[PDB]
Design a binder for these strands. Sequence first.
RNA 1: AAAUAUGUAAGAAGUCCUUGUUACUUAAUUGAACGUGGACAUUUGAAUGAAGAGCUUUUAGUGGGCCAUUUUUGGUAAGC
RNA 2: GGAAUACUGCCAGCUGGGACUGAGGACUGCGACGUAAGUCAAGGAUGCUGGCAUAAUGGUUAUAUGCCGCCCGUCUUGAAACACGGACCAAGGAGUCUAACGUCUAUGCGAGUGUUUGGGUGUAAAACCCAUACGCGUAAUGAAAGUGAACGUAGGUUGGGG
RNA 3: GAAAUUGUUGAAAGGGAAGGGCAUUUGAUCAGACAU
Lengths: 119, 149, 176, 143, 215, 125
Amino acid sequence: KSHGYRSRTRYMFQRDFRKHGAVHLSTYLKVYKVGDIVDIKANGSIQKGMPHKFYQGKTGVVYNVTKSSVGVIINKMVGNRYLEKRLNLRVEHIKHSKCRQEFLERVKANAAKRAEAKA
Amino acid sequence: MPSRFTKTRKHRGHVSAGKGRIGKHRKHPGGRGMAGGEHHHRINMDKYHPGYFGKVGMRYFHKQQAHFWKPVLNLDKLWTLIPEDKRDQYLKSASKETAPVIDTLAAGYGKILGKGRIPNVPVIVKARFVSKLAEEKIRAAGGVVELIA
Amino acid sequence: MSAQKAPKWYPSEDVAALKKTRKAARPQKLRASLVPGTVLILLAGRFRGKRVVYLKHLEDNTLLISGPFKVNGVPLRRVNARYVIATSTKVSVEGVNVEKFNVEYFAKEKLTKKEKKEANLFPEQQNKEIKAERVEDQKVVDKALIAEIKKTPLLKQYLSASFSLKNGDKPHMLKF
Amino acid sequence: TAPKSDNVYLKLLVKLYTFLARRTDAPFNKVVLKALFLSKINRPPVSVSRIARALKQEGAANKTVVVVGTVTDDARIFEFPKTTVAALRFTAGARAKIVKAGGECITLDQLAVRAPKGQNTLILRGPRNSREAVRHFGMGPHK
Amino acid sequence: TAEQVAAERAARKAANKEKRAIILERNAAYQKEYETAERNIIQAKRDAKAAGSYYVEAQHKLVFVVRIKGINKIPPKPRKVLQLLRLTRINSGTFVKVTKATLELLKLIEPYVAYGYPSYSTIRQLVYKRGFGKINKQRVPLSDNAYGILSIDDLIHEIITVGPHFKQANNFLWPFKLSNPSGGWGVPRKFKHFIQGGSFGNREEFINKLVKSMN
Amino acid sequence: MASLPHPKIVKKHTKKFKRHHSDRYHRVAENWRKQKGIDSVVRRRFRGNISQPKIGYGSNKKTKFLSPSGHKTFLVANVKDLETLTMHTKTYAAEIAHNISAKNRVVILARAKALGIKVTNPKGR
RNA sequence: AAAUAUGUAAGAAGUCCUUGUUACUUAAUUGAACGUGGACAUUUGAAUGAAGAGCUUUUAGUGGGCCAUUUUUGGUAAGC
RNA sequence: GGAAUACUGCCAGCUGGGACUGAGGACUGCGACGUAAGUCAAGGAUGCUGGCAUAAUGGUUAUAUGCCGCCCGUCUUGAAACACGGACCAAGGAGUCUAACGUCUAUGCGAGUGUUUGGGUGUAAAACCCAUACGCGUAAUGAAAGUGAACGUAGGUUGGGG
RNA sequence: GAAAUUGUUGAAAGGGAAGGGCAUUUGAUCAGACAU
């Protein structure tokens, strides 16, 4: 009925199930990378590392790393045109990804030279 | 005068525009002439403009400043690249060997400022100073400026 | 995918630890004696939505039916030969399959195992008691699409030229 | 296309080139044809200063600049350049100072009965107005 | 002299000559590859009931999937689907390999198309007949912007056993512009179906005939 | 001046194609005019009613403007003009003029009568 | 805790190797970001489609909308 | 036990019946057939044999007849509308002009460019000729006082291409 | 000396109505093609 900045969020910005408090001090270790692709995922414990709604679920790529807890950024883009907007999120809210085919970049290249000598 | 209108005097009962869906007088143009100030038709583009889109500077009762300009990146043309002339020698030095006088009788010919490069040996007559990079440029190569008290 | 096959232990459903998916088949045809054992298929109907073990060892022209494993009304009439009976066995395979793979009265879809089709009747015992010995009495006759089919050898040979040869088979039927 | 309309002659040129091209293999043609076509803007107006910076050096200058438009006087108090390069027209100070140089004001036709090949010819064309932008309100470009 | 007018000639002629006794050292010959196997599979099923089973045997080709409906008022996804499976015409129709990025698509369309599943002859005719070129037919001739390989009978000899460089071949043939039913119609109501009668669905087998009448 | 079989292959709408309701109401006049209005059953084109006419009805180039039975035409209207066609045959052929007098006419005939040329305005006055 | 729909990623300018730059912080042979020299790309799941593709200006009309199928809000209901 | 048909296929296997259609020197280039000159059809449409007719054939046109077709213009989601305008003819009637501007496109010049009023003259509103000016443009930025550019690149490289 | 519009002559059509559109029958009328 009103349009405040967390509106509708009641279940999106949800929490847990039983993991209902306190950052996994792992989810806190780990190092960014002025290039590595991050995947937003808000968590009410924090609160800059709350990503203002829309950018929920959306995966992008670290463009800033103010690594002093200040997570990175990335952007993404949105509807009509895609005008890519950038958002400075915080270290406790973002997460890695499935660029995990570089595992198959490797698999490829390597197995492919072992294919050179093989052929 | 076979414009682009005559081609219209026929098809459609109008052209500009959509039958009856619009077409009125001084009309829809909300106001007759730059109207819709901070209200109706507004969207900026805009503004400032040292006049009419947001006021603030300082007033007076004015007159005529000074016909100035002439950069040094070409104090060669200046008025002496005429021939030219007192050319690729060396003068030598001051005295009266290569004096081009950037000026007139009532309101100017410049203020030898510019970028440039020069090369040889010009005397520079003026008052329009200046550039001090200019100075530092003329004297760069036997350059010497003079003014008028 | 996929390819090739076999099986042969029950009728059917088998060989897991990895498992199957589809329809080892054999086009459930028929139907012995004169015009009994018939495609009798009930017209006497209030529409397609039905079925259940029709098989009168009664007599023949003395055959009888059914209407569900049973719980929306489950009836059971008889029939004799040419009425709510013949004369289509389906539009088979293609509808005939829909059928089998809508015997999800035991959990399939595109999964593992096939006909695995309940009890007997010359389903098995047929091409599964014995193994169609003539499958051998088959080899004997090579016969080939041969004779005039075929006869290319003694004919279209003079055409296997046109085979890719727009050529000869441009000479006649296929032009512009 | 390629048209443009006017100065028959101007048109005739189109022919000789359209005449070459499709005809000739290569490129410096193709290019100078679709070039002969273009409209008065997006059609620079390269100056001797340009045709000069361009030549000397870039590690090649024994080539013939082919500016497909006018070609300005400019005033680079010295240097320049002695080279052969022209086309559409040339301003006073130009084919004049290009005459001190001095190479040859090539007249883009002649410079084809020569340029027959295209080799050692540098197609130099360049610049953006005159007008910004639009549209001032971000902010960004002005006016 | 103008014996050069007889230069290229000796060539061209004999040249053509070779190619064809080539086009034909093969174009038959393969009609044995094809034939050969078609007996084997028979024999196979038979070795089956030599005992048991066998012999489930999978396929594969697919399938002239021919547009059995319209333009006006069609889906929105399923539209672009059609568009990219590339068949923009009423009674039209391409051929598409039985790969799950193919299949999946097929189904997303099933409602409104008609996944046949080609026969041999149906390919021949559906090739040769209305089937051909971005412009018509002359063997190694036009059909040698191949260049993998040439022969109308080779466009077939690929298409109808797809695989290998194969179906960049099918990138070629504006496809169809097949006839409206021709003889038969397809029973009653068509524009909705599968089994249950009609159209709108994936015959096989009975995939040809509804094509058989057309080209 | 041997003519494509396109005699009567010209072209359809051998038939005036004239203004809509005007085939009726009094001071509605000449033609084509595309009742350009917001409803008129014509501009819509439901079955029945005038037929409007539009490129595609046009006449097939290889027998286009000539077109006559003979072929071509030209208001030869001054002897020399009445040449202008001398060497050229057949195809093309002349007509006199609204304008061209009585006296001069017998000539124009005459003169061309022999120069090899055909007069459409055969007669005239 | 579905289905539908919804983000990304894809073969690959990509890895792999050598070192070089200083405001950065590590105690630094600490890394960071950038750059040189060097091996292999047409690439061995993605599929399918291209009447190239990208790009810049400009200036009309329009802003009263209405139908259906499914999913729904109010309302006994409605051609609401 | 031994066949037989039925049914579903695919021939590069034979032939009848009808219908409509004919839009280019050679050529061609693809081919076949013929052991052989050459022949088809193969290609570039379809070429052949024989008959008829001084108004025959079509064009209009008015009629009849099968079928079909309601008033247009109008604003409307919505017009045949039980919404408005219009009995009928003529002839008239409506996006122009100007100042001042945006694009864009011609044309001249071009780092310059336009004579401006006004002079010179003239076959006199013409045409042709020219001053010390002026306007716009070649410098910007500041409220203002001020102050004001390389390396028309070698203290600008960097990926981009044609 | 157009038109609305009226007279007369001449033809043609009409079971509550006006007049289109496609094909043709009939009548009326016209051009070409003339081939020498």
